[PDB]
Amino acid sequence: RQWYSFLASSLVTFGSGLVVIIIYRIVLWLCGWMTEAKDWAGELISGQTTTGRILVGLVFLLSIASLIIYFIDASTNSSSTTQQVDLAFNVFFMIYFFIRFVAANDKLWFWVELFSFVDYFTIPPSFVAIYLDRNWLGLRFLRALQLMSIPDILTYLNVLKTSTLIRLVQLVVSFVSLWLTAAGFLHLLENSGDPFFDFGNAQHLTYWECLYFLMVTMSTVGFGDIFATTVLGRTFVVIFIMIFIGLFASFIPEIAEILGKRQKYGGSYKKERGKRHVVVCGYITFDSVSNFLKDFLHKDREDVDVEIVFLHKGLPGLELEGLLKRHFTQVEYFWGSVMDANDLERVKIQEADACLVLANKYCQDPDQED
Amino acid sequence: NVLKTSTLIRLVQLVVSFVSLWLTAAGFLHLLENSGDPFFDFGNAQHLTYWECLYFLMVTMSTVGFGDIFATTVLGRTFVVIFIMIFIGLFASFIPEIAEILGKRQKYGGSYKKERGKRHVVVCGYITFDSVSNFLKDFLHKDREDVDVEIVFLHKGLPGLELEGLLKRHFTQVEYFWGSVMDANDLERVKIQEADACLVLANKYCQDPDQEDAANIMRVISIKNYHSDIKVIVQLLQYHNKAYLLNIPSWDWKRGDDAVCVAELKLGFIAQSCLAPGFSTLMANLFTMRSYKPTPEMSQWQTDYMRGTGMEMYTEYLSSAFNALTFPEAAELCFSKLKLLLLAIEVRESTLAINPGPKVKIENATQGFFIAESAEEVKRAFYYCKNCHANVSDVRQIKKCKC
Ligand SMILES: [Ca+2]
Ligand SMILES: [K+]
Ligand SMILES: [K+]
Ligand SMILES: [K+]
Ligand SMILES: [K+]
Ligand SMILES: [K+]
Ligand SMILES: [Mg+2]
Ligand SMILES: [Mg+2]
């Protein structure tokens, strides 16, 4: 029954501000403190002031609290605790919306920025909810998109130090925020039912069934234990298929690539209480190591407990990794180079018995090798 | 003539080919399933809508295959088999090529919107996370006096993620644009008609320094062809290439056009250590912004050295209290009272005099050159009171209330 009142509250608040901006632009086309305010608000939202650094943290955390209130409203079922706290958070988001409005260079491109729509589709409906005594579930899920600010927060802080960690956190949080958002959108359409059929054609899916069904479809598994049946939910599933198969099929391999590109022979040589060790470096390969070890560890030598510690800037090939495992009790291998003082400390070379520097006897040029 | 470029041609071909084949195949399945099969006297049939067929073809060509809808006539099933063999290839090749074309778009296009009374500096040439971070931490350093200068990077490339993070940390005072100083349209975008200066950074670690110098000389030629009177500061790797830009028709050191020749400077700092051992270190530390900051792990010789590294070169107007002192008296005053080391003065055309003898007086409004920990420390020499208002010499108390 009442849904159009909540929807109208977002459309009139969007449209009226857009009209005011167009009128103001045409008036000043035909016919200082504000720059200090712009740059102050800019330093706030950029996290350059301490008050900014906070405000940004509070906007993030309260957006998560608002999202969790939406999950509770979606897993359940104006005098209620949930409508009260989510209204309080909406008032806080409205203050932050004005701070971005001040900070922005162009008011028109600001009034069409993505988070301005998240605000239009949430603050006005949250006022209407208490006014009409009706906790409408509505577009509130869109707050999940505020998760997508995490790479900016972790960049306004110096914590996200490397290009691969930046790319990793961007991929994961982009995926999760879009998946949570699209699940809320399908949940709205299927539980609404279609307007062309007077909302009679509808399904009572939970949010969690929609979240599962979107994972099952974007992976292209498509069990069909759950499926959309409204014409809006089916046209949404068609649009979702054209977009999110591309996302899943590109994101999951790039996550697997970043998680695969990790040093497996990092860490440090733990010097045993009374044993000697020899560091070995330079040309380290299955051919050099096998010929070295079969002479060094040969049974015709007297029995002496010397550990061999290979140090090399590379991953072992599978043949060498097998050979290292056959000598596990007396041979150890570390990623690194004798050119770094940190790697020399790892191999514990202060208290090695000797260091052996092996040469590539079959290099293209012996002076570069020497 | 509207579809102007090869990628827009390919884009519109892919989209409309896909949509027309998908709409056509949906009509074909709708005919077969609602017809029913002729072998069974049309008794085996389904009353699908066209829209259910259009949906079912999308659900099958994407390989999702819910099976909420499926074909049941032998003709509709053999059509679905033929459709699967053809359209899986189309979907799996078209959707990535659409995503590629939509991805290959300039993200740092657009134009510098010149704020009403702020200055800006254009920066170009070798722009990378390594060059930009080292540049910005000296340019925006807190030991300099507070001035609102915007930095506008112009470069023919997309920022790496490290540089894009650095640009976002300086969002209030640093902006970046895709483009080259070789294009008059890009020079207009960066608004270089009303920039304060243009800085042309060099790749000091290029495979060949003459190709790098030739590129940077062409950039100055381009910048000054667009507007002669912009101050250009350029980094050069070789001294003999400096002759080429001295011969540009519109290059003028009297406007402050300036070629920072890395080889000229490097070897002259080294020559100075041949005359006064270690002076290369004294003088090189003096020309980058650093602030002292002890640590408990630091040995006492390192604390002395590091306290010295915290000082750099500054310029200020000497206060009226210095007028008609000899230079030695002004230097004694600055040191013994103000804790400031006065090296030199710009004598009124004008000429720079370093440690001049008793024969020169300080004029009115003389620029002096100082060594100090920060610009805000040197401002004591400008605020320095009449002797009546600065007898106490607890130097933090020197301030603009001199009268
Ligand atoms: Ca300093
Ligand atoms: K599949
Ligand atoms: K499937
Ligand atoms: K399936
Ligand atoms: K199925
Ligand atoms: K099924
Ligand atoms: Mg061991
Ligand atoms: Mg600006």
PDB file of N, CA, C and O in Angstrom, chain A residues 116-179:
ATOM      1  N   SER A 116      25.668  10.312  -2.941  1.00  0.00           N
ATOM      2  CA  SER A 116      24.537  11.224  -2.826  1.00  0.00           C
ATOM      3  C   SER A 116      23.221  10.481  -3.057  1.00  0.00           C
ATOM      4  O   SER A 116      22.281  10.673  -2.293  1.00  0.00           O
ATOM      5  N   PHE A 117      23.168   9.538  -4.009  1.00  0.00           N
ATOM      6  CA  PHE A 117      21.998   8.677  -4.175  1.00  0.00           C
ATOM      7  C   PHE A 117      21.764   7.786  -2.967  1.00  0.00           C
ATOM      8  O   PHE A 117      20.628   7.674  -2.521  1.00  0.00           O
ATOM      9  N   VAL A 118      22.811   7.196  -2.385  1.00  0.00           N
ATOM     10  CA  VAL A 118      22.662   6.410  -1.151  1.00  0.00           C
ATOM     11  C   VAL A 118      22.011   7.253  -0.058  1.00  0.00           C
ATOM     12  O   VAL A 118      21.122   6.780   0.649  1.00  0.00           O
ATOM     13  N   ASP A 119      22.387   8.522   0.053  1.00  0.00           N
ATOM     14  CA  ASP A 119      21.763   9.442   0.992  1.00  0.00           C
ATOM     15  C   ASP A 119      20.310   9.782   0.599  1.00  0.00           C
ATOM     16  O   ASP A 119      19.412   9.608   1.425  1.00  0.00           O
ATOM     17  N   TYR A 120      20.020  10.146  -0.654  1.00  0.00           N
ATOM     18  CA  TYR A 120      18.646  10.431  -1.103  1.00  0.00           C
ATOM     19  C   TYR A 120      17.696   9.254  -0.865  1.00  0.00           C
ATOM     20  O   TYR A 120      16.556   9.441  -0.456  1.00  0.00           O
ATOM     21  N   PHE A 121      18.144   8.028  -1.121  1.00  0.00           N
ATOM     22  CA  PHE A 121      17.335   6.829  -0.937  1.00  0.00           C
ATOM     23  C   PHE A 121      17.273   6.340   0.511  1.00  0.00           C
ATOM     24  O   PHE A 121      16.632   5.325   0.761  1.00  0.00           O
ATOM     25  N   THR A 122      17.861   7.047   1.478  1.00  0.00           N
ATOM     26  CA  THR A 122      17.832   6.601   2.879  1.00  0.00           C
ATOM     27  C   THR A 122      17.361   7.669   3.862  1.00  0.00           C
ATOM     28  O   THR A 122      16.451   7.379   4.640  1.00  0.00           O
ATOM     29  N   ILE A 123      17.876   8.906   3.829  1.00  0.00           N
ATOM     30  CA  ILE A 123      17.485   9.890   4.853  1.00  0.00           C
ATOM     31  C   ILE A 123      15.993  10.240   4.754  1.00  0.00           C
ATOM     32  O   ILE A 123      15.280  10.077   5.742  1.00  0.00           O
ATOM     33  N   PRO A 124      15.455  10.640   3.585  1.00  0.00           N
ATOM     34  CA  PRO A 124      14.050  11.004   3.476  1.00  0.00           C
ATOM     35  C   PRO A 124      13.108   9.842   3.831  1.00  0.00           C
ATOM     36  O   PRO A 124      12.236  10.041   4.678  1.00  0.00           O
ATOM     37  N   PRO A 125      13.313   8.604   3.342  1.00  0.00           N
ATOM     38  CA  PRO A 125      12.547   7.462   3.818  1.00  0.00           C
ATOM     39  C   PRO A 125      12.631   7.252   5.331  1.00  0.00           C
ATOM     40  O   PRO A 125      11.623   6.919   5.943  1.00  0.00           O
ATOM     41  N   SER A 126      13.784   7.479   5.966  1.00  0.00           N
ATOM     42  CA  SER A 126      13.900   7.322   7.420  1.00  0.00           C
ATOM     43  C   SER A 126      13.082   8.364   8.198  1.00  0.00           C
ATOM     44  O   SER A 126      12.531   8.040   9.247  1.00  0.00           O
ATOM     45  N   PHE A 127      12.905   9.580   7.667  1.00  0.00           N
ATOM     46  CA  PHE A 127      11.969  10.554   8.237  1.00  0.00           C
ATOM     47  C   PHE A 127      10.517  10.091   8.064  1.00  0.00           C
ATOM     48  O   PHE A 127       9.757  10.028   9.032  1.00  0.00           O
ATOM     49  N   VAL A 128      10.142   9.696   6.845  1.00  0.00           N
ATOM     50  CA  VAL A 128       8.792   9.206   6.533  1.00  0.00           C
ATOM     51  C   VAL A 128       8.409   8.003   7.401  1.00  0.00           C
ATOM     52  O   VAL A 128       7.265   7.909   7.832  1.00  0.00           O
ATOM     53  N   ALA A 129       9.354   7.120   7.732  1.00  0.00           N
ATOM     54  CA  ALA A 129       9.095   5.935   8.546  1.00  0.00           C
ATOM     55  C   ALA A 129       8.492   6.268   9.918  1.00  0.00           C
ATOM     56  O   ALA A 129       7.465   5.704  10.301  1.00  0.00           O
ATOM     57  N   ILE A 130       9.095   7.211  10.646  1.00  0.00           N
ATOM     58  CA  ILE A 130       8.569   7.644  11.945  1.00  0.00           C
ATOM     59  C   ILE A 130       7.284   8.461  11.745  1.00  0.00           C
ATOM     60  O   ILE A 130       6.320   8.280  12.484  1.00  0.00           O
ATOM     61  N   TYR A 131       7.222   9.310  10.719  1.00  0.00           N
ATOM     62  CA  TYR A 131       6.040  10.125  10.423  1.00  0.00           C
ATOM     63  C   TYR A 131       4.771   9.294  10.146  1.00  0.00           C
ATOM     64  O   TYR A 131       3.698   9.633  10.647  1.00  0.00           O
ATOM     65  N   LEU A 132       4.887   8.195   9.395  1.00  0.00           N
ATOM     66  CA  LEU A 132       3.777   7.299   9.051  1.00  0.00           C
ATOM     67  C   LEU A 132       3.630   6.085   9.989  1.00  0.00           C
ATOM     68  O   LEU A 132       2.776   5.234   9.745  1.00  0.00           O
ATOM     69  N   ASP A 133       4.443   5.975  11.045  1.00  0.00           N
ATOM     70  CA  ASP A 133       4.459   4.819  11.958  1.00  0.00           C
ATOM     71  C   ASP A 133       4.687   3.467  11.244  1.00  0.00           C
ATOM     72  O   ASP A 133       4.060   2.454  11.569  1.00  0.00           O
ATOM     73  N   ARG A 134       5.564   3.456  10.234  1.00  0.00           N
ATOM     74  CA  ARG A 134       5.782   2.320   9.331  1.00  0.00           C
ATOM     75  C   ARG A 134       7.264   2.132   9.031  1.00  0.00           C
ATOM     76  O   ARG A 134       7.848   2.877   8.248  1.00  0.00           O
ATOM     77  N   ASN A 135       7.868   1.106   9.621  1.00  0.00           N
ATOM     78  CA  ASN A 135       9.252   0.712   9.373  1.00  0.00           C
ATOM     79  C   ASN A 135       9.420   0.013   8.014  1.00  0.00           C
ATOM     80  O   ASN A 135       9.626  -1.199   7.952  1.00  0.00           O
ATOM     81  N   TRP A 136       9.314   0.759   6.910  1.00  0.00           N
ATOM     82  CA  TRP A 136       9.536   0.225   5.565  1.00  0.00           C
ATOM     83  C   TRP A 136      10.975  -0.274   5.395  1.00  0.00           C
ATOM     84  O   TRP A 136      11.927   0.407   5.778  1.00  0.00           O
ATOM     85  N   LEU A 137      11.146  -1.468   4.826  1.00  0.00           N
ATOM     86  CA  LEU A 137      12.467  -2.065   4.639  1.00  0.00           C
ATOM     87  C   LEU A 137      13.242  -1.367   3.512  1.00  0.00           C
ATOM     88  O   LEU A 137      14.404  -1.012   3.685  1.00  0.00           O
ATOM     89  N   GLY A 138      12.561  -1.085   2.404  1.00  0.00           N
ATOM     90  CA  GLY A 138      13.003  -0.150   1.373  1.00  0.00           C
ATOM     91  C   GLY A 138      14.397  -0.386   0.798  1.00  0.00           C
ATOM     92  O   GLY A 138      14.898  -1.505   0.735  1.00  0.00           O
ATOM     93  N   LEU A 139      15.032   0.704   0.366  1.00  0.00           N
ATOM     94  CA  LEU A 139      16.376   0.722  -0.228  1.00  0.00           C
ATOM     95  C   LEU A 139      17.511   0.790   0.810  1.00  0.00           C
ATOM     96  O   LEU A 139      18.654   1.086   0.475  1.00  0.00           O
ATOM     97  N   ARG A 140      17.237   0.536   2.079  1.00  0.00           N
ATOM     98  CA  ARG A 140      18.263   0.703   3.127  1.00  0.00           C
ATOM     99  C   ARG A 140      19.524  -0.109   2.958  1.00  0.00           C
ATOM    100  O   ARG A 140      20.579   0.279   3.422  1.00  0.00           O
ATOM    101  N   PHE A 141      19.426  -1.237   2.309  1.00  0.00           N
ATOM    102  CA  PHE A 141      20.609  -2.043   1.992  1.00  0.00           C
ATOM    103  C   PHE A 141      21.707  -1.263   1.266  1.00  0.00           C
ATOM    104  O   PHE A 141      22.853  -1.698   1.279  1.00  0.00           O
ATOM    105  N   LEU A 142      21.393  -0.143   0.644  1.00  0.00           N
ATOM    106  CA  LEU A 142      22.392   0.546  -0.154  1.00  0.00           C
ATOM    107  C   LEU A 142      23.544   1.042   0.672  1.00  0.00           C
ATOM    108  O   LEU A 142      24.568   1.416   0.139  1.00  0.00           O
ATOM    109  N   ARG A 143      23.394   1.031   1.977  1.00  0.00           N
ATOM    110  CA  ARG A 143      24.454   1.489   2.832  1.00  0.00           C
ATOM    111  C   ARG A 143      25.620   0.550   2.778  1.00  0.00           C
ATOM    112  O   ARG A 143      26.669   0.846   3.307  1.00  0.00           O
ATOM    113  N   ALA A 144      25.444  -0.602   2.169  1.00  0.00           N
ATOM    114  CA  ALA A 144      26.517  -1.566   2.057  1.00  0.00           C
ATOM    115  C   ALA A 144      27.578  -1.009   1.184  1.00  0.00           C
ATOM    116  O   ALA A 144      28.740  -1.328   1.330  1.00  0.00           O
ATOM    117  N   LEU A 145      27.180  -0.173   0.261  1.00  0.00           N
ATOM    118  CA  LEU A 145      28.155   0.501  -0.589  1.00  0.00           C
ATOM    119  C   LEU A 145      29.192   1.289   0.212  1.00  0.00           C
ATOM    120  O   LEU A 145      30.303   1.467  -0.265  1.00  0.00           O
ATOM    121  N   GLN A 146      28.912   1.718   1.444  1.00  0.00           N
ATOM    122  CA  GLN A 146      29.923   2.400   2.259  1.00  0.00           C
ATOM    123  C   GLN A 146      31.093   1.496   2.650  1.00  0.00           C
ATOM    124  O   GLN A 146      32.185   2.011   2.878  1.00  0.00           O
ATOM    125  N   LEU A 147      30.948   0.167   2.628  1.00  0.00           N
ATOM    126  CA  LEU A 147      32.095  -0.741   2.727  1.00  0.00           C
ATOM    127  C   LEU A 147      33.154  -0.410   1.678  1.00  0.00           C
ATOM    128  O   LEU A 147      34.346  -0.469   1.947  1.00  0.00           O
ATOM    129  N   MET A 148      32.728   0.020   0.495  1.00  0.00           N
ATOM    130  CA  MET A 148      33.608   0.307  -0.633  1.00  0.00           C
ATOM    131  C   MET A 148      34.523   1.518  -0.403  1.00  0.00           C
ATOM    132  O   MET A 148      35.445   1.746  -1.177  1.00  0.00           O
ATOM    133  N   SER A 149      34.324   2.270   0.683  1.00  0.00           N
ATOM    134  CA  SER A 149      35.240   3.317   1.144  1.00  0.00           C
ATOM    135  C   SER A 149      36.456   2.786   1.912  1.00  0.00           C
ATOM    136  O   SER A 149      37.436   3.511   2.036  1.00  0.00           O
ATOM    137  N   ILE A 150      36.459   1.540   2.396  1.00  0.00           N
ATOM    138  CA  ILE A 150      37.568   0.976   3.180  1.00  0.00           C
ATOM    139  C   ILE A 150      38.954   1.154   2.534  1.00  0.00           C
ATOM    140  O   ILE A 150      39.882   1.503   3.263  1.00  0.00           O
ATOM    141  N   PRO A 151      39.163   0.989   1.214  1.00  0.00           N
ATOM    142  CA  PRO A 151      40.473   1.197   0.614  1.00  0.00           C
ATOM    143  C   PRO A 151      40.922   2.657   0.725  1.00  0.00           C
ATOM    144  O   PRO A 151      42.107   2.914   0.897  1.00  0.00           O
ATOM    145  N   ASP A 152      39.990   3.613   0.678  1.00  0.00           N
ATOM    146  CA  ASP A 152      40.292   5.022   0.916  1.00  0.00           C
ATOM    147  C   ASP A 152      40.664   5.250   2.377  1.00  0.00           C
ATOM    148  O   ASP A 152      41.698   5.841   2.637  1.00  0.00           O
ATOM    149  N   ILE A 153      39.902   4.723   3.342  1.00  0.00           N
ATOM    150  CA  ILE A 153      40.239   4.852   4.766  1.00  0.00           C
ATOM    151  C   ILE A 153      41.640   4.307   5.032  1.00  0.00           C
ATOM    152  O   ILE A 153      42.480   5.001   5.596  1.00  0.00           O
ATOM    153  N   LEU A 154      41.938   3.100   4.563  1.00  0.00           N
ATOM    154  CA  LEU A 154      43.246   2.473   4.741  1.00  0.00           C
ATOM    155  C   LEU A 154      44.358   3.093   3.871  1.00  0.00           C
ATOM    156  O   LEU A 154      45.503   2.652   3.946  1.00  0.00           O
ATOM    157  N   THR A 155      44.032   4.105   3.060  1.00  0.00           N
ATOM    158  CA  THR A 155      44.966   4.939   2.288  1.00  0.00           C
ATOM    159  C   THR A 155      45.112   6.345   2.881  1.00  0.00           C
ATOM    160  O   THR A 155      46.167   6.961   2.754  1.00  0.00           O
ATOM    161  N   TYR A 156      44.086   6.876   3.544  1.00  0.00           N
ATOM    162  CA  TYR A 156      44.177   8.100   4.340  1.00  0.00           C
ATOM    163  C   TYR A 156      45.015   7.849   5.594  1.00  0.00           C
ATOM    164  O   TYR A 156      45.826   8.691   5.977  1.00  0.00           O
ATOM    165  N   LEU A 157      44.889   6.660   6.183  1.00  0.00           N
ATOM    166  CA  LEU A 157      45.924   6.060   7.019  1.00  0.00           C
ATOM    167  C   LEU A 157      47.041   5.483   6.135  1.00  0.00           C
ATOM    168  O   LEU A 157      46.798   5.085   5.005  1.00  0.00           O
ATOM    169  N   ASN A 158      48.264   5.371   6.644  1.00  0.00           N
ATOM    170  CA  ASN A 158      49.413   4.859   5.879  1.00  0.00           C
ATOM    171  C   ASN A 158      49.541   3.319   5.884  1.00  0.00           C
ATOM    172  O   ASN A 158      50.566   2.780   5.472  1.00  0.00           O
ATOM    173  N   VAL A 159      48.534   2.598   6.385  1.00  0.00           N
ATOM    174  CA  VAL A 159      48.597   1.157   6.684  1.00  0.00           C
ATOM    175  C   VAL A 159      48.626   0.239   5.452  1.00  0.00           C
ATOM    176  O   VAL A 159      49.275  -0.806   5.484  1.00  0.00           O
ATOM    177  N   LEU A 160      47.961   0.595   4.353  1.00  0.00           N
ATOM    178  CA  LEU A 160      47.862  -0.258   3.161  1.00  0.00           C
ATOM    179  C   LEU A 160      49.069  -0.054   2.228  1.00  0.00           C
ATOM    180  O   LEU A 160      48.975   0.569   1.174  1.00  0.00           O
ATOM    181  N   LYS A 161      50.241  -0.518   2.670  1.00  0.00           N
ATOM    182  CA  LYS A 161      51.552  -0.033   2.194  1.00  0.00           C
ATOM    183  C   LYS A 161      51.926  -0.360   0.745  1.00  0.00           C
ATOM    184  O   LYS A 161      52.684   0.404   0.153  1.00  0.00           O
ATOM    185  N   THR A 162      51.451  -1.464   0.172  1.00  0.00           N
ATOM    186  CA  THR A 162      51.967  -1.993  -1.110  1.00  0.00           C
ATOM    187  C   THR A 162      50.890  -2.113  -2.179  1.00  0.00           C
ATOM    188  O   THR A 162      49.712  -2.309  -1.885  1.00  0.00           O
ATOM    189  N   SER A 163      51.286  -2.025  -3.447  1.00  0.00           N
ATOM    190  CA  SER A 163      50.362  -2.046  -4.586  1.00  0.00           C
ATOM    191  C   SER A 163      49.470  -3.296  -4.624  1.00  0.00           C
ATOM    192  O   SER A 163      48.269  -3.198  -4.866  1.00  0.00           O
ATOM    193  N   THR A 164      50.013  -4.470  -4.305  1.00  0.00           N
ATOM    194  CA  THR A 164      49.230  -5.713  -4.253  1.00  0.00           C
ATOM    195  C   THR A 164      48.247  -5.740  -3.092  1.00  0.00           C
ATOM    196  O   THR A 164      47.123  -6.181  -3.287  1.00  0.00           O
ATOM    197  N   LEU A 165      48.591  -5.219  -1.914  1.00  0.00           N
ATOM    198  CA  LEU A 165      47.638  -5.110  -0.806  1.00  0.00           C
ATOM    199  C   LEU A 165      46.538  -4.093  -1.112  1.00  0.00           C
ATOM    200  O   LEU A 165      45.379  -4.340  -0.796  1.00  0.00           O
ATOM    201  N   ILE A 166      46.863  -2.989  -1.788  1.00  0.00           N
ATOM    202  CA  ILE A 166      45.861  -2.033  -2.263  1.00  0.00           C
ATOM    203  C   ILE A 166      44.890  -2.737  -3.211  1.00  0.00           C
ATOM    204  O   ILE A 166      43.685  -2.726  -2.977  1.00  0.00           O
ATOM    205  N   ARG A 167      45.401  -3.408  -4.245  1.00  0.00           N
ATOM    206  CA  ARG A 167      44.576  -4.124  -5.220  1.00  0.00           C
ATOM    207  C   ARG A 167      43.735  -5.220  -4.568  1.00  0.00           C
ATOM    208  O   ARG A 167      42.554  -5.327  -4.871  1.00  0.00           O
ATOM    209  N   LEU A 168      44.303  -5.989  -3.644  1.00  0.00           N
ATOM    210  CA  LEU A 168      43.602  -7.030  -2.901  1.00  0.00           C
ATOM    211  C   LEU A 168      42.405  -6.472  -2.142  1.00  0.00           C
ATOM    212  O   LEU A 168      41.290  -6.949  -2.322  1.00  0.00           O
ATOM    213  N   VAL A 169      42.612  -5.463  -1.302  1.00  0.00           N
ATOM    214  CA  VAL A 169      41.522  -4.912  -0.498  1.00  0.00           C
ATOM    215  C   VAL A 169      40.475  -4.240  -1.375  1.00  0.00           C
ATOM    216  O   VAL A 169      39.290  -4.415  -1.118  1.00  0.00           O
ATOM    217  N   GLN A 170      40.868  -3.557  -2.453  1.00  0.00           N
ATOM    218  CA  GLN A 170      39.915  -3.031  -3.430  1.00  0.00           C
ATOM    219  C   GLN A 170      39.048  -4.131  -4.038  1.00  0.00           C
ATOM    220  O   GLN A 170      37.829  -3.997  -4.027  1.00  0.00           O
ATOM    221  N   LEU A 171      39.633  -5.223  -4.536  1.00  0.00           N
ATOM    222  CA  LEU A 171      38.871  -6.312  -5.141  1.00  0.00           C
ATOM    223  C   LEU A 171      37.894  -6.927  -4.144  1.00  0.00           C
ATOM    224  O   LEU A 171      36.703  -6.994  -4.431  1.00  0.00           O
ATOM    225  N   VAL A 172      38.366  -7.337  -2.966  1.00  0.00           N
ATOM    226  CA  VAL A 172      37.525  -8.027  -1.982  1.00  0.00           C
ATOM    227  C   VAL A 172      36.358  -7.154  -1.557  1.00  0.00           C
ATOM    228  O   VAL A 172      35.213  -7.591  -1.597  1.00  0.00           O
ATOM    229  N   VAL A 173      36.606  -5.906  -1.173  1.00  0.00           N
ATOM    230  CA  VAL A 173      35.532  -5.077  -0.633  1.00  0.00           C
ATOM    231  C   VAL A 173      34.591  -4.567  -1.720  1.00  0.00           C
ATOM    232  O   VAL A 173      33.397  -4.403  -1.475  1.00  0.00           O
ATOM    233  N   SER A 174      35.080  -4.371  -2.940  1.00  0.00           N
ATOM    234  CA  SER A 174      34.225  -4.064  -4.080  1.00  0.00           C
ATOM    235  C   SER A 174      33.269  -5.218  -4.350  1.00  0.00           C
ATOM    236  O   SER A 174      32.059  -5.035  -4.349  1.00  0.00           O
ATOM    237  N   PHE A 175      33.786  -6.442  -4.442  1.00  0.00           N
ATOM    238  CA  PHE A 175      32.978  -7.637  -4.639  1.00  0.00           C
ATOM    239  C   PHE A 175      31.913  -7.797  -3.560  1.00  0.00           C
ATOM    240  O   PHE A 175      30.728  -7.900  -3.862  1.00  0.00           O
ATOM    241  N   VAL A 176      32.313  -7.777  -2.291  1.00  0.00           N
ATOM    242  CA  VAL A 176      31.388  -7.991  -1.182  1.00  0.00           C
ATOM    243  C   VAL A 176      30.333  -6.900  -1.123  1.00  0.00           C
ATOM    244  O   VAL A 176      29.160  -7.207  -0.959  1.00  0.00           O
ATOM    245  N   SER A 177      30.690  -5.632  -1.304  1.00  0.00           N
ATOM    246  CA  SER A 177      29.693  -4.564  -1.262  1.00  0.00           C
ATOM    247  C   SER A 177      28.708  -4.644  -2.427  1.00  0.00           C
ATOM    248  O   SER A 177      27.510  -4.488  -2.205  1.00  0.00           O
ATOM    249  N   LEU A 178      29.149  -4.947  -3.646  1.00  0.00           N
ATOM    250  CA  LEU A 178      28.255  -5.116  -4.788  1.00  0.00           C
ATOM    251  C   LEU A 178      27.359  -6.343  -4.627  1.00  0.00           C
ATOM    252  O   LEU A 178      26.164  -6.247  -4.866  1.00  0.00           O
ATOM    253  N   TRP A 179      27.889  -7.472  -4.165  1.00  0.00           N
ATOM    254  CA  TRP A 179      27.111  -8.682  -3.906  1.00  0.00           C
ATOM    255  C   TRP A 179      26.045  -8.463  -2.832  1.00  0.00           C
ATOM    256  O   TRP A 179      24.874  -8.745  -3.070  1.00  0.00           O
TER     257      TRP A 179
END
